[PDB]
Amino acid sequence: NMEEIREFAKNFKIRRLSLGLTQTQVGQAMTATEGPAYSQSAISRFEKLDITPKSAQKLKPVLEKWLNEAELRNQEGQQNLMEFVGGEPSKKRKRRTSFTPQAIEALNAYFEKNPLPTGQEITEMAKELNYDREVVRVWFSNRRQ
Amino acid sequence: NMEEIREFAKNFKIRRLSLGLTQTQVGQAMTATEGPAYSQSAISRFEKLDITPKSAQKLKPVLEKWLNEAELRNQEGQQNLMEFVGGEPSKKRKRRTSFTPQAIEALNAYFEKNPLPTGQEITEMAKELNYDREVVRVWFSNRRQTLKNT
DNA sequence: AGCATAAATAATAA
DNA sequence: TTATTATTTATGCT
C-alpha cells in the first residue's frame, strides 16, 4: 500500500516542522519510548523515504501515533511539548573501546545475571555502557569459552 | 507592534521550510541586488528575532512582498518556483567522500599535531593528499567540532 | 539491525 | 556585510 505512505512521510516532515522540531529531538523522544528503530538518521531516511516498503509500513503507524500524542502535548502550552520530548538530552559522545576497571566490573555483573546474551541484549548492554558493540560481544564470547 | 512581527517571525520560518528553502536562498534571491542586499545572516537573525524592533518593522514588509509573492507565483509549476529564486540553483548534493585509511591517519596525525591550521597550510595538506581542499578544510572543521563530546 | 561522520544549513562573530 | 563556528541532515557502512 504505497502512495498512502509517501503522503504520510510528507505530512510528517511538515507537522514536525510545525511543532518546530528537529529530527534529532524526535529521535530522542522516540528512541526513549519506542526503540532504536527511531533514531535521527531513521527519521531522516523515513522522511526521505529511503527505506524498503516493509520497513516504512512498519514505522508509519508508530510515527503517526506518537506524532499525534506530541501534537496534543503541544496544545496545552508550547512547553508541554518540551515535557513530552526531552527536552535536551545532549551529550552525544563517542563509544569507548578501551576497558576501565569500572567497565569490566559492570560487564561481569551482567555476566552473573546473563552468561549467554542474545545479540539484542548485547546491543542494549553496550549502549548503556557506552562501549563499542564489538568490544562487548567479543568480551562475552571469550568469557564463556 | 510586537506579536504582529513576532508571529510573522515564527510563521515565516516554517513557510520557508515548508517550501524546501534555505535562508541562504531567500536572501540570495530576494537580494535587490542593486541595494538593498539581503544576506543569509539577515534571514537567520530575522527569524530568530535578533534585530531592533525598529528594523524588524522595516524588514517585515519587504518579506511578505516576497514570501506571499512566491508562495503562489512559485507554487503552480515548481520549475518556475525555482526561478522565483533563480541564480542557476538546482544542483545535486556533493557525494559523501570515503577516505582511504592511509589518508585517515595522515589527517589525525597532522591533527593531533596541529588542531586549527591555516587556509595556507590546509591547502598544502590537501594538495599532496590528492583530496580537494574544501573536503579537507571540513575534516578538520568536523573533527575539531566533534572531540568536544568525548 | 543505527553508528560514525561528511555535507549542508543555520547561528554567531568580525 | 562578510567569515566562521555550531547545529542538523544525510549517507556510507554488511
Q: How far is CA A97 from CA A129, A139, A143, B2, in A?
A: 10, 11, 17, 53
CATH number of B98-150: 1.10.10.60
Q: With H, G, I as helix, E, B as strand and everything else as coil, classify residue A145.
A: coil
Which CATH superfamily, name and number, covers A1-83?
A: lambda repressor-like DNA-binding domains (1.10.260.40)
Among A residues 12-71, those touching chain B with beta carbons less than 8 Å apart? 14, 17-18, 20
Q: What is the resolution of this structure in A?
A: 2.5
CA-based nearest residue in chain B for residue A17: B14
CATH architecture of B1-87: Orthogonal Bundle (1.10)
CA-based nearest residue in chain B for residue A18: B14
Which residue's C-alpha is at the least distance from the C1' of C6? B96
CB-based contact B149 A20, cutoff 8 Å: no
Would the Cβ of B96 be found within 7 angstroms of any atom in strand D?
yes
Q: CA-based angle A122:A101:B148, to the nearest 5?
A: 80
CA-based nearest residue in chain B for residue A20: B14
Q: With H, G, I as helix, E, B as strand and everything else as coil, classify residue A131.
A: strand
Residue B15 to residue B19: CA distance in whole angstroms: 6
For residue B14, list chain A residues with Cβ-Cβ distance below 8 A: 17-18, 20
Same topology, domains B1-87 and B98-150? Answer is: no
Is it true that domain A84-145 has CATH number 1.10.10.60? yes
Q: How far is CA A135 from CA A36, A94, B55, in A?
A: 19, 14, 57
Of A14, A91, A94, the CB nearest to B18: A14
Q: Where are the domains of chain B?
A: 1-87, 98-150
For residue B150, list chain A residues with Cβ-Cβ distance below 8 A: 93-94
